[PDB]
Amino acid sequence: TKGTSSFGKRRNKTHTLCRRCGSKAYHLQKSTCGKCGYPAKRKRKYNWSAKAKRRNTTGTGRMRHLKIVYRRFRHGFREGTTPKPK
Amino acid sequence: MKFNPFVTSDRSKNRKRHFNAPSHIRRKIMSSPLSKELRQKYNVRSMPIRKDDEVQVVRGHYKGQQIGKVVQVYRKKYVIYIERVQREKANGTTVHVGIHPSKVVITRLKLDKDRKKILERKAKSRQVGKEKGK
Amino acid sequence: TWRRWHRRVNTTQKRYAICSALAASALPALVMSKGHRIEEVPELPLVVEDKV
Amino acid sequence: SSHKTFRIKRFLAKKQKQNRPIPQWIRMKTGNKIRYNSKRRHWRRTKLGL
Amino acid sequence: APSRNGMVLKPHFHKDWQRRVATWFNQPARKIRRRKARQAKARRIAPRPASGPIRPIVRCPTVRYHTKVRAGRGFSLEELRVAGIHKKVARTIGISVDPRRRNKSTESLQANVQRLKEYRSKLILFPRKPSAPKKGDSSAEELKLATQLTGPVMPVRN
Amino acid sequence: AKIKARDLRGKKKEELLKQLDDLKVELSQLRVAKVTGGAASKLSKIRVVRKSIARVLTVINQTQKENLRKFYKGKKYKPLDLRPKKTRAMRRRLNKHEENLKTKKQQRKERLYPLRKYAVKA
Amino acid sequence: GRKRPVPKGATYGKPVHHGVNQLKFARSLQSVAEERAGRHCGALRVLNSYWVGEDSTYKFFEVILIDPFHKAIRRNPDTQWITKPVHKHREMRGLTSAGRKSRGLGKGHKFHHTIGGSRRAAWRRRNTLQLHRYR
RNA sequence: CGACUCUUAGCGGUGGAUCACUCGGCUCGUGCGUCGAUGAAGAACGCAGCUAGCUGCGAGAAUUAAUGUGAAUUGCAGGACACAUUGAUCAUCGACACUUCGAACGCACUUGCGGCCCCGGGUUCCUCCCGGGGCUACGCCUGUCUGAGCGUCGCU
RNA sequence: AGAUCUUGGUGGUAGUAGCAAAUAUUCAAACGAGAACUUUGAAGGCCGAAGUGGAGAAGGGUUCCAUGUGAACAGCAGUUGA
RNA sequence: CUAAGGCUAAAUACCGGCACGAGACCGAUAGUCAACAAGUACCGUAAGGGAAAGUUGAAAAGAACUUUGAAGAGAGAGUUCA
RNA sequence: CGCGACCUCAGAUCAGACGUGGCGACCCGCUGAAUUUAAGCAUAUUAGUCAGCGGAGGAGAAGAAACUAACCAGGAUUCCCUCAGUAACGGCGAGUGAACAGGGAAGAGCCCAGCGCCGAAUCCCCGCCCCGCGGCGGGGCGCGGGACAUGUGGCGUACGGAA
Numbered sequence A: 001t002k003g004t005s006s007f008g009k010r011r012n013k014t015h016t017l018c019r020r021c022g023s024k025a026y027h028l029q030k031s032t033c034g035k036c037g038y039p040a041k042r043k044r045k046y047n048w049s050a051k052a053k054r055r056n057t058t059g060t061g062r063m064r065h066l067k068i069v070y071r072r073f074r075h076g077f078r079e080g081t082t083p084k085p086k
Numbered sequence B: 001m002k003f004n005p006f007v008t009s010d011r012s013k014n015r016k017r018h019f020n021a022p023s024h025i026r027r028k029i030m031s032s033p034l035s036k037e038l039r040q041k042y043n044v045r046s047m048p049i050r051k052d053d054e055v056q057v058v059r060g061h062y063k064g065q066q067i068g069k070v071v072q073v074y075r076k077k078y079v080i081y082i083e084r085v086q087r088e089k090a091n092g093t094t095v096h097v098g099i100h101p102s103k104v105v106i107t108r109l110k111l112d113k114d115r116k117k118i119l120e121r122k123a124k125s126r127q128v129g130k131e132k133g134k
Numbered sequence C: 001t002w003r004r005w006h007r008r009v010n011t012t013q014k015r016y017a018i019c020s021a022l023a024a025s026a027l028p029a030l031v032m033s034k035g036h037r038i039e040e041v042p043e044l045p046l047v048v049e050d051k052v
Numbered sequence D: 001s002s003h004k005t006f007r008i009k010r011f012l013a014k015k016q017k018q019n020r021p022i023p024q025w026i027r028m029k030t031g032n033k034i035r036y037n038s039k040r041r042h043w044r045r046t047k048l049g050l
Numbered sequence E: 001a002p003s004r005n006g007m008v009l010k011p012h013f014h015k016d017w018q019r020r021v022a023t024w025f026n027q028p029a030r031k032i033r034r035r036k037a038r039q040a041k042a043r044r045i046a047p048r049p050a051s052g053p054i055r056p057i058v059r060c061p062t063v064r065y066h067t068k069v070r071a072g073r074g075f076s077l078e079e080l081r082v083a084g085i086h087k088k089v090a091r092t093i094g095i096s097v098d099p100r101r102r103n104k105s106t107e108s109l110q111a112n113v114q115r116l117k118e119y120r121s122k123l124i125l126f127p128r129k130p131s132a133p134k135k136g137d138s139s140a141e142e143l144k145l146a147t148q149l150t151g152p153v154m155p156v157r158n
Numbered sequence F: 001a002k003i004k005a006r007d008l009r010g011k012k013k014e015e016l017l018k019q020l021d022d023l024k025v026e027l028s029q030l031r032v033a034k035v036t037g038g039a040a041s042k043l044s045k046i047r048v049v050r051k052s053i054a055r056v057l058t059v060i061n062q063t064q065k066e067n068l069r070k071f072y073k074g075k076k077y078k079p080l081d082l083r084p085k086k087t088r089a090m091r092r093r094l095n096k097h098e099e100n101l102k103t104k105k106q107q108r109k110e111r112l113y114p115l116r117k118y119a120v121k122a
Numbered sequence G: 001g002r003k004r005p006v007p008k009g010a011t012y013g014k015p016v017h018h019g020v021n022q023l024k025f026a027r028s029l030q031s032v033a034e035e036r037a038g039r040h041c042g043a044l045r046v047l048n049s050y051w052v053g054e055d056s057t058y059k060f061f062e063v064i065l066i067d068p069f070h071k072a073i074r075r076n077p078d079t080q081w082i083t084k085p086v087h088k089h090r091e092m093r094g095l096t097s098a099g100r101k102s103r104g105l106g107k108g109h110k111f112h113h114t115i116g117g118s119r120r121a122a123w124r125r126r127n128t129l130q131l132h133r134y135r
Numbered sequence H: 001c002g003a004c005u006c007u008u009a010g011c012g013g014u015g016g017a018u019c020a021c022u023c024g025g026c027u028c029g030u031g032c033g034u035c036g037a038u039g040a041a042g043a044a045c046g047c048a049g050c051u052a053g054c055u056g057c058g059a060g061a062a063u064u065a066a067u068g069u070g071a072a073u074u075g076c077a078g079g080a081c082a083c084a085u086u087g088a089u090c091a092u093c094g095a096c097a098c099u100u101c102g103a104a105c106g107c108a109c110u111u112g113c114g115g116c117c118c119c120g121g122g123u124u125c126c127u128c129c130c131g132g133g134g135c136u137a138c139g140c141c142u143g144u145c146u147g148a149g150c151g152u153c154g155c156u
Numbered sequence I: 001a002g003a004u005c006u007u008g009g010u011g012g013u014a015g016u017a018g019c020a021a022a023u024a025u026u027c028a029a030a031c032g033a034g035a036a037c038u039u040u041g042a043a044g045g046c047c048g049a050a051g052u053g054g055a056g057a058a059g060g061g062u063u064c065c066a067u068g069u070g071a072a073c074a075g076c077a078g079u080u081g082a
Numbered sequence J: 001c002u003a004a005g006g007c008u009a010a011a012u013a014c015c016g017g018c019a020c021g022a023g024a025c026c027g028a029u030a031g032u033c034a035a036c037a038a039g040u041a042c043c044g045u046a047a048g049g050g051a052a053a054g055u056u057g058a059a060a061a062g063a064a065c066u067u068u069g070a071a072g073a074g075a076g077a078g079u080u081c082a
Numbered sequence K: 001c002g003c004g005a006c007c008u009c010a011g012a013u014c015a016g017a018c019g020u021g022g023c024g025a026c027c028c029g030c031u032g033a034a035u036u037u038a039a040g041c042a043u044a045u046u047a048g049u050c051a052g053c054g055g056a057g058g059a060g061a062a063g064a065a066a067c068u069a070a071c072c073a074g075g076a077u078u079c080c081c082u083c084a085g086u087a088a089c090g091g092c093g094a095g096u097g098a099a100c101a102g103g104g105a106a107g108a109g110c111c112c113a114g115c116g117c118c119g120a121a122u123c124c125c126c127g128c129c130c131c132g133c134g135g136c137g138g139g140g141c142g143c144g145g146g147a148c149a150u151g152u153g154g155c156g157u158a159c160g161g162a163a
């Protein structure tokens, strides 16, 4: 039976959590993430899905360092200085 | 009218700036006029509201010449609480009625070094403007 | 965005329209019909000295 | 299962910790607009990502 | 489908044109930016002419336009040579030079060297050190007679 | 009775570490009080002690870092955390000295044929 | 030449695109050698290359690389240009002599394809519909 | 007479249209036009007295310092705070700090296991155990050291 | 006013079909506002060791345990409950 | 004109980013999918797909207290200009 | 039958540097369809476009003629107007399709190799001293190392150049 009876046999996970990109698309048997292609040095990204690009583009996360870069840019990336003490 | 191309007259932008202002400029927004005697003594017109100054209400249900001291500046709700400006609720307890600082007039200022310093700063700027426009 | 928002007019026609607008500003009936409350203006082609 | 890796156990721990009702005093805050935890999950209604 | 009389039309709209459409809503802004840059440059080169170096007198090439005359890129090296101007000093005093232009006829040569002599006569040279006028010009003719020139220097006129 | 950053800077390392240890002990006791019911005042004192620990730690770290900066001033090679962190691209670009130095030919040109200040009569 | 990398030579489409053999790469083999040298030595800058020998099955080129961070390169004008950020991986953008030849650049009637800097620049200029404000 | 059904109206329900509003979009224009091995983007996990989300932050964790400001934050509680033997809050942000994955860097990971050098302890220098600190990726450039060659030679 | 139009809401059908696979329940008492369904006791049966028993793997992820509630859910109910 | 070596600013482009200004545009089935804890809830093994959801009041002054009910729910009373 | 010099290679957790990955609207180099139109369809068209790969910068690319021209001649590149839906291409069918001159925006030019001359005049690194720090430079010294005659530097580049 291709229907209900065969749905009882699925007890073996094909995909697991990926250490990059944190997505449940890491093929256990191929050792390749279906979303980011983790063992590849470059992120998997395609232009035929702009929605997929904007789901995980820059700015969709924290930008812990880019926020400071954007703030530091407005003062010429000054370093080693402090405001004049009171 | 407004000629500076870097200040906006957009209604949505002004309202967003007003309702999301930080408290250090919510203090500036929540300013109150001074009384005629105070306006004469100190050459200033308005003053940001403060914890322990005495005001009277000039608009609304609590109009009158009775002088009540401010007891809370609730900058999150853009209101202030006054001593005798309060109402009874159902269970018989009294709750302060928040009224806008622009609807009161300050009849005595809570003075420390900071308020005094702001007072000479405003007065000197107004004097400079009067001497320029004379 | 390419709706052709702008129209170009012949320069002679624009000057013609300016002349017609100026000529109609010297007739009290037309300025009254624009609702301009000219009842105590001493002279409709109202000219003041250069001190202004 | 009873056998599990450390990462799986940690993931399930977080999913346990964030599956609780809102505190009662949240509805007293100014401009709340929050009525209940709309991200509540039941182990039998919907299944986790893993 | 054709309909009665009419012109056989061939619109070139078979090639996904809407992805490459250039609107001109920044044209007034571009003009403002260009004017501001022009004024800033004119302020930078304070006594120097605003339009730039002097250009030679140049006849238009083909049989359609050879009756007209216009301004060229720069003065040919033979014009500079007979005008007595070094080819490396000319650019310092605002003379545009064109090393790759030749002088086929003597009339254009002589016209351009009269142009160069007239420009050199009309030039006011500021000394490198204002307190030390070595050989440039008298201080009197550069006190108040110096003024930034607006428009092309000695415009080419038919 | 809060602790401030200003009056910590004059102290030296031993009493700074002593005060940090005492603050850590007090924070541990406050957590013990938190898990055993405790009182609301002791619960509120948790944040005060945590910020005091942060203050002591940042004073210690700043003093150590500035001492290291004074030690490595004037040295050819410095630790990467002591070097400026403008931008990777900004760190790869040429310094002022090798940016503004010219060939002998170029400076001979600038000496022989300098740009002149001139005006043209109309 | 460049055999089309399709399975079993099957290019599904119209017969004008059925070609699998007798096809040619648009860039010379010298450009390919320069690109491989630049890709392997990513911290160096390709300057030029030249021909040193060939076989029936191999062509040999020697590629000149410059280390942009050596002080001899970095302190010397007329050579500091290669140290600029804009001059990295020139051979992958077709800016070396071997890579430039395949772009169809030049002056005059034979090189009308690349007026504007490239084929794509000219194509965009000639295929853009200039809709002014006043038509 | 009633029930039932139909039509119309009053009222009450169900439903959320219309209208009014708008801290949102869309479009146009302007000025800048700046990421990363000094570890980016992204991800995971944690951090609040009471806190699940959002937001902010990183074991110094809903923030430290500094500067400006100048009496609040607030849902409750608590406790500061002579505002001058210096100051709540907010803003700015140049000092400091910044867990684990991730180009991700000792090897490997749906697990875990090493090696080298210092420090402390159990030891009472000797190297076993425990803890801490610093190193240990690939490619490549200049130089250094150590080498290889029945490669080319010289002397013996 | 139509497009087997899009989205949302609402009728008749209609208190209708239906809540019928695997033999079966009954008496008394307790708690409780409220008991065919909870709990205790007594009786009658069933699974009958290739079990409706006792334990695991995969998978689930807190469903485990105790206390409390009776809004919603457990297609009747519930004082019971994954 | 002088190939098979090299550099070079400006005018030029900009549906990504930082920060702004504006509009004969839209007005919660519209306008971005997203005016709101939205690339969220949820679906699929995965690539990926992807919503719905704005408005008390000027101020909570958010209905004290009595009364029937086990409660939900009511009848009075009260706040409010409503 | 060892010791040296060079050449060509190798190792190092050697000293000090550099690259990787992201974004990718604009830009550069490749690769590259078919739907579609032709009232069918195969060349053609869609289109050197979508998809795919690589590489940058605040812009990029191009760029100072192995040019346009045929005139009484202009004079690097890039952009706008026009040339012009034109010359031309095309089952000469559907369709495709520039350039020169002209008017403007901007305007800027230059450097090597080679031929030569000058006692390698040249460059890098390591130690020491002084001036500075704030992007790490300036000066002086070292019978201090290395690169380099298998060619560094100065003059000099087609507009001629040198003596």
Ligand SMILES: [Mg+2]
Pocket: A002
């Ligand atoms: Mg099947």
Ligand SMILES: [Mg+2]
Pocket: A014, A029
């Ligand atoms: Mg399998």
Ligand SMILES: [Mg+2]
Pocket: none
């Ligand atoms: Mg299930």
Ligand SMILES: [Mg+2]
Pocket: F105
């Ligand atoms: Mg030279």
Ligand SMILES: [Mg+2]
Pocket: G014, G016
């Ligand atoms: Mg075809």
Ligand SMILES: [Mg+2]
Pocket: none
């Ligand atoms: Mg109704």
Ligand SMILES: [Mg+2]
Pocket: none
């Ligand atoms: Mg502070």
Ligand SMILES: [Mg+2]
Pocket: H111
């Ligand atoms: Mg294993």
Ligand SMILES: [Mg+2]
Pocket: none
């Ligand atoms: Mg040998």
Ligand SMILES: [Mg+2]
Pocket: none
């Ligand atoms: Mg209808």
Ligand SMILES: [Mg+2]
Pocket: none
């Ligand atoms: Mg029935």
Ligand SMILES: [Mg+2]
Pocket: I020
């Ligand atoms: Mg039945």
Ligand SMILES: [Mg+2]
Pocket: I045
């Ligand atoms: Mg029996």
Ligand SMILES: [Mg+2]
Pocket: I048
């Ligand atoms: Mg039996």
Ligand SMILES: [Mg+2]
Pocket: none
């Ligand atoms: Mg069993």
Ligand SMILES: [Mg+2]
Pocket: none
């Ligand atoms: Mg249970």
